[PDB]
Design an enzyme around this catalytic site. Structure first.
Site, short mmCIF file in Angstrom:
data_model
loop_
_atom_site.label_atom_id
_atom_site.label_comp_id
_atom_site.label_asym_id
_atom_site.label_seq_id
_atom_site.Cartn_x
_atom_site.Cartn_y
_atom_site.Cartn_z
CG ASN A 188 -3.96 4.63 -3.93
OD1 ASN A 188 -4.02 4.53 -2.74
ND2 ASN A 188 -3.19 5.74 -4.49
CG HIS A 212 3.01 -3.27 -8.34
ND1 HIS A 212 1.88 -2.54 -7.87
CD2 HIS A 212 3.30 -3.02 -9.54
CE1 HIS A 212 1.31 -1.98 -9.00
NE2 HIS A 212 1.96 -2.64 -9.89
#
EC number: 3.2.2.29
Lengths: 182, 182
Positions: A18, A29
């Site tokens: 997460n 990311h």
DNA sequence: CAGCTCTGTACGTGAGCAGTGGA
DNA sequence: CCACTGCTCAGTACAGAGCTGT
């Protein structure tokens, strides 16, 4: 909250616990440049040049790779999540992978899989190693492949160039899977 | 995102640069560690038990301390607050201190004061020292006391204990001014 | 070239952490 | 299975490159 990067026709899907404060913040990311994800990728010939978190959006169309996580709530670290919170998590993750159906679900670090397994598969994988696992994604042909955490907040390897083995292997596993359909 | 904690009649007002990812995330000042902030306070004698980012709103009425920051956007930190931003930050920060008028305005870390001063007073300071500064806050009896960052990003004050010194000073400077004051 | 300023980079520590293998 | 290992990540001083006037 950090955006999933998912399309159809993926080879690989990287899969975090997460997103963290940094990554929530940058909106991409694996921002480090400490963390090893992006170097590993370059190192392994998984990417031809060396990219960084800013290029994540390009990974599906151009390297057939995408990103997501068990939980979407953003915290400082896994230690901030409930058991409960993980259930609804992999519930929702199974449902994604059933929808997008990549070749391989890749798990960031034993930790996350170790959960998924004794959750999705009702089984405490004992004595676990990295790489291809025996079970497919339920109702799919998607493989699970466990990868040493890209976080250098780890014991080894941490150091981007020792987790390259597992990247190479993953990469080859991908390669194998495209020959099947010759 | 991170709320000021300010009253009238404060001795001290810690002024951070801006609120980083943790603090933003948890709505509370100096979470870390490493911040040596909550540490110092205690081992400087400025509080009588060691407390933390969640007693932050008790610091007025119990120790007449309050909190705020120069700039207000959340960033990692820090080396990524714009040139501009900081200036405008300081215009607001001044107004508050003329609003609230604490006996002293502690600047947490150089480059803020370094910059605040550069802006407010028209001086690029030679060789800044930590401690009391020449100028008052324009149109108030409020002092400026610089202090080295409580961030641990900072090599040249390795440990929290390399910093308590200024807190013991800070105490004193307050302790003097407190009477005066018969 | 000191002094002035304008970037650039190189720095200690602890806390948290993934992993392994120790009670 | 608490501990132990390497390695992340949370402002500031000095280096040096490039102008001024002895």
């Amino acid at each position: 909250t950090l955006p999933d990067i998912l399309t159809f026709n993926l080879d690989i899907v990287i899969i975090g616990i997460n997103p963290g404060l940094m990554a929530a913040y940058k909106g991409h990311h694996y921002p480090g440049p400490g963390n090893h994800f992006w170097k590993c990728l370059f190192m392994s010939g998984l990417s031809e040049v060396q990219l960084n978190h800013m290029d994540d959006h390009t990974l599906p169309g151009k390297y057939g790779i995408g990103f997501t996580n068990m939980v979407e709530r953003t915290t400082p670290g896994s230690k901030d999540l409930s058991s409960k919170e993980f259930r609804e998590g992999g519930r929702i993750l199974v449902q994604k992978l059933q929808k997008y159906q990549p070749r391989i679900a890749v798990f960031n670090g034993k930790c996350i899989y170790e959960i998924f397994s004794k959750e999705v598969f009702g089984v405490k994988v004992k004595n676990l190693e990295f790489g291809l696992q025996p079970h497919k994604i339920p109702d799919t042909e998607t493989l699970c492949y466990v990868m040493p955490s890209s976080s250098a907040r780890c014991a080894q390897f941490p150091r981007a160039q020792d987790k390259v083995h597992y990247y190479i292997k993953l990469k080859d596993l991908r390669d194998q899977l495209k020959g099947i359909e010759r």
